[PDB]
Subunit: 319 residues, 3 copies
Amino acid sequence: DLDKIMTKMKNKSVINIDDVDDEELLAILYTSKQFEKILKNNEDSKYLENKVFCSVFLEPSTRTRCSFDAAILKLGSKVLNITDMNSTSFYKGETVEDAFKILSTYVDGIIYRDPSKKNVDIAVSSSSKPIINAGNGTGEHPTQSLLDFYTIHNYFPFILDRNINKKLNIAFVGDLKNGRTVHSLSKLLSRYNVSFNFVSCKSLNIPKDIVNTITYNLKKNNFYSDDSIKYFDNLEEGLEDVHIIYMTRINAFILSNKTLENTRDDTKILHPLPRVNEIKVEVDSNPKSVYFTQAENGLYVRMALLYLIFSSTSSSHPQ
Amino acid sequence: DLDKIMTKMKNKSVINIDDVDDEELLAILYTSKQFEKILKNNEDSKYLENKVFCSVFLEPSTRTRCSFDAAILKLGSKVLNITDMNSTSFYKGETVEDAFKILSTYVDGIIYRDPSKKNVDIAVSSSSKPIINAGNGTGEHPTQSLLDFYTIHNYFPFILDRNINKKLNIAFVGDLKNGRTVHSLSKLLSRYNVSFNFVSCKSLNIPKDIVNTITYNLKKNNFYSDDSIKYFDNLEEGLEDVHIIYMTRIQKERFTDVDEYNQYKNAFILSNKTLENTRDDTKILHPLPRVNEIKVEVDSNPKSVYFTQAENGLYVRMALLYLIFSSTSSA
Amino acid sequence: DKIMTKMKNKSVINIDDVDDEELLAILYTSKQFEKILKNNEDSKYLENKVFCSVFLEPSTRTRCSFDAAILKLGSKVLNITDMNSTSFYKGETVEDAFKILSTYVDGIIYRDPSKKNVDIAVSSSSKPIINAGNGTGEHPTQSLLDFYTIHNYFPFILDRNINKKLNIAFVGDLKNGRTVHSLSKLLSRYNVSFNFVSCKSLNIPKDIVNTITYNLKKNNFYSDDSIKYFDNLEEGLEDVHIIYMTRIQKERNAFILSNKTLENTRDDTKILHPLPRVNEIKVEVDSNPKSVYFTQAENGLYVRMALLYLIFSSTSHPQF
Ligand SMILES: CC(C)(C)OC(=O)Nc1sc(-c2ccccc2)cc1C(=O)NCCO
């Protein structure tokens, strides 16, 4: 019931993927799809005009910031930017609480990226306007989790069915210790009938805190077993019967056409990007690779999220 | 008569607060109030669409620039920004006169902030388009003066009456030497029936050039007396029978070194304790940011309005853009 | 409308990417925008588009020019700015960066001192790119607005009439002035004669004289009065319809234009300069009705709007 769920999402801050429930995730995935088709058919997309937002990027994060700016502009709204700056030069004197209390009186909402853990939680306390977390230094990056999930759902829409018979399996590969992109998606995936293969070098294993959240969430839905989670130190074994391969950022695990010879027919490769050697150019040509569609889907998910939070009357729903 | 006054203000450059006369101040205050209500009642605010402005900020001044950006965008216009730059890296050796002659052919108006005194005066000579000064070195910051005045007028609308019997008293507290925010507002307030209490440390007293402008302006309106201006070095006396307390910034970079800053940054800290012996109706202003001047405890105190003040900048900057750039007689 | 259909989704990198018919559409459209704007008419002929402006060197005048064009057409733009090749491309391939960026937006305005980077950007981008300047000297929009200016005062450059020939003096640093090279290339397609005025070790490169010579021959306009070389203004500024003065960049004077040095030029001569100036042209000359370097800079808005409109329209033509 889009309209029940829209009323509930109106003026919601999105900081953590756990701020988004079952019903909300469904509206986001249904709305993101409507924006994918509207844009792909070159139709009018101005479903959120008359908003003025502030984008605050206190670390270099060009790809994410351009993603949000494009979302806002394609919806027909305007944005004022703070950019190419850091915590100390932005907040010259000033308490984060004063800066957000004032900033939030000029605009309808704020997109905030800040390496500081604390600063985003203060910004939410202090802001009279909704804030969307664009990434901080606890690894909260909800929009990346949501667009990772949207990608996977398009190839395997039975993840949403919670079907004891239809289980999805995924390999996370590379640096699982620091890959906060893995942690955030794991958290979201484990809400569903999903199995995990953690492929790493020893001193970059998945943290225990994360194994525990997966284990807790799989048990809540009666999908936990001894084949819920498995750990490999090599691709050959690790890439076995997996519907998704998700490669992390920063040798041990370079994806090549050779190393994809014994994967499922239907397997799809994700990567939050940028890459460096993790995935060889040769793989871009391989029909299993979808990391570029994934990045593209960021636009449709960020538009859907802005639409669902900031729409006023909302009557003329996306079609 | 907003129609007569709007025709007169169309294409006006606003550089100093003395560019703004009686009638114009009234239009600005009346228009700013209309934008306060429009925004507070979630109505359409796109009263100035199809304009394209350049915002040129050649010093870090993020809060003022965001204020102007929001004003322009909420009016339904567009803006190209120059930002995170300084005079020499922008001009790369080109005359300010050539740069503004060219820039002003691409856009409808320019918002200009530059620490250089001279640069803004030249920009106005050379520009074929109206300029709003968003702050320069000489202390001219007309939009801060206008939003300071708008705030005060909302709580004490009899400043506008020039009634011999209804007089407003204001304490400016802190750094009155370098607080160019005090000098600009003093200049505007003294046009009216106002009395001043300058509260400072000795080596941060108000300059005499400013006392003389106040004195001259109060005489012109037959409001001068020897209780027009009083000087205190302490809050107890200084905050006595005053309708407004205006607290200034303490800016470390106006001080020979760190040691001079600290010996003055905590001379006058406003607390709930130090507001015991003020009028019931007194209101606290601060152009912000604060650092210690005002204890968080005071934010909860109904006398504090420094956050409303900051908020009012959006309404005053929208009003001023609308009055200068709109092509038509409407509201 | 024939020419617009053909230009739709074109990348413009080099002035040689623009042909006879395309140059005519650009000149006709740029004039439509000049009149619309000068008469304060609605100019929103390209709404609902979203561009990315990527400027990986400080180039304020050109960047603001394109941003103003995009906004006056009624479209939106997200800016990357005050960044320099290595800090953008944190360590990422130019090909990945453009493959992704081009999925968010309708078109990209790209300035980058790297030669290579712009060519990679065009290979990788699923969207049209307009080159706003690179470090081979390609700057098509500057050539287009230089040509538009000249055409306004001497519209017989377009006629290719053996009897109506235009003569132009390029003055200053002809070696490095890649603004001269780009315009020379475009002018020589027409019935034009060239006077290169310089100090010896800043003469025009031979590669450029050869392109002029080739293009004049192709149209049967070449002769031994096609190109002439002076080391002084007196001779060099002889019977020339256009004087184009160059920048002198001290990272790499002899010819100051004054009212004195313009006394024995044609009555109809017009002075261009891509700007900024320093001493090349005395402020006294601004008052002289021959000077048009400020109209030239102004015409950048009309030409950049025309070019955006001709490429990005997907759809009542621009009228007065
Ligand atoms: C209100 C008044 C003080 C009169 O004007 C401004 O808004 N101008 C200024 S300058 C400034 C500042 C802060 C610390 C160190 C140096 C300069 C604060 C702001 C500002 O706008 N924000 C700067 C945020 O980085």
